[PDB]
C-alpha cells in the first residue's frame, strides 16, 4: 500500500552467487575465500541498495558511507537469515545458491558458533511468521542501527530518518502492540551475531597471510579500518531493549 513498501520491493537486490567450486572438497581456505569474495559482491549490492533508500540522500555523504560500512555485516546476516528461511526452511545456511552451508561446512569454516546463532535467527523468521514486508522494513532499519558513540557529522538528519523508519515499521505491523515487542527484540538479536562475525573476520584478516585465505581489497580495508571501531567500542549499536 504505501509508496514506502513499493520502494523496498523495487530496490531489493537479486540473487548473488559466491563463485564457489562445489566440486572441490571443503577446506577452510576455499570456504573462507568464497565467503570473502561473496562478502565483497554483497557489499557492492548493499551500497547500491542503500543509496536508493528513501530519504537516504538527506544524510551527509560521510555519514552515508559510514553507516553502510558499520551496518553491512548485520544486514547480510539478516538477509541471509531470510534467504535460509525461505529457500530451505532453515535446515541449512543459504549464503548463496552456490554456497549453502550444511553442518559439515559449518564446522569446516570454523564458524560453527556463529553459524549456529544464525541458523537460530533463521528459525525465528519461522517461529514468528515474519512476513516479506516486515522483513524488508526491518532490514532497512538495520542500516540505521549502528553509529559512532560520538555521533555522526549530522546527527539530526540521521535521527529523523531512523525515526521515520520506525514509524513505517509500525504502520505495516498495523495485541499487535506485542508484535512490535517481538520484532524489536528480533532486531536487537542481530547485533551480537554481527559482533561475533566481526571478531572472526578481523582475527582472520590478521592471520590471513598465514592460513592462505585471500581477502578482497575492499574487505581488507573495511575489516581493518571500520570494524576495529566497532570491536573497540567507539561504534555501538542502537538497541531497542536494554
Amino acid at each position: 500500500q504505501p509508496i514506502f513498501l513499493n520502494v523496498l520491493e523495487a530496490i531489493e537486490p537479486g540473487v548473488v552467487c559466491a563463485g564457489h567450486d562445489n566440486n572441490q572438497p571443503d577446506s577452510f581456505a576455499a570456504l573462507l575465500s568464497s565467503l570473502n569474495e561473496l562478502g565483497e559482491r554483497q557489499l557492492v549490492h548493499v551500497v547500491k541498495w542503500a543509496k536508493a533508500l528513501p530519504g537516504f540522500r538527506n544524510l551527509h555523504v560521510d555519514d552515508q558511507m559510514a553507516v553502510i560500512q558499520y551496518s553491512w555485516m548485520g544486514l547480510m546476516v539478516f538477509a541471509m537469515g531470510w534467504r535460509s528461511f525461505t529457500n530451505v526452511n532453515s535446515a541449512m545456511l543459504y549464503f548463496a545458491p552456490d554456497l549453502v552451508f550444511n553442518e559439515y561446512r559449518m564446522h569446516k569454516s570454523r564458524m560453527y558458533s556463529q553459524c549456529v546463532r544464525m541458523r537460530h535467527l533463521s528459525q525465528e523468521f519461522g517461529w514468528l511468521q515474519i512476513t516479506p514486508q516486515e522483513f524488508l522494513c526491518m532490514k532497512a532499519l538495520l542500516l540505521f542501527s549502528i553509529i559512532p558513540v560520538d555521533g555522526l557529522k549530522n546527527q539530526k538528519f540521521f535521527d529523523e530518518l531512523r525515526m521515520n523508519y520506525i514509524k513505517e515499521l509500525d504502520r505495516i505491523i498495523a495485541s499487535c502492540s506485542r508484535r512490535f515487542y517481538q520484532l524489536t527484540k528480533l532486531l536487537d538479536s542481530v547485533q551480537p551475531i554481527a559482533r561475533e562475525l566481526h571478531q572472526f573476520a578481523f582475527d582472520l584478516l590478521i592471520k590471513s597471510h598465514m592460513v592462505s585465505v585471500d581477502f578482497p581489497e575492499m574487505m581488507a580495508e573495511i575489516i581493518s579500518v571500520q570494524v576495529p571501531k566497532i570491536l573497540s567500542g567507539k561504534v555501538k549499536p542502537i538497541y531497542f531493549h536494554t
Binding site: 552515508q64 558511507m65 560500512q69 573495511i222
Partner: peptide, 7 residues
Amino acid sequence: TLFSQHY
C-alpha cells in the same frame, strides 16, 4: 580509501 574511492 577503497570505499570512498568507489563512492
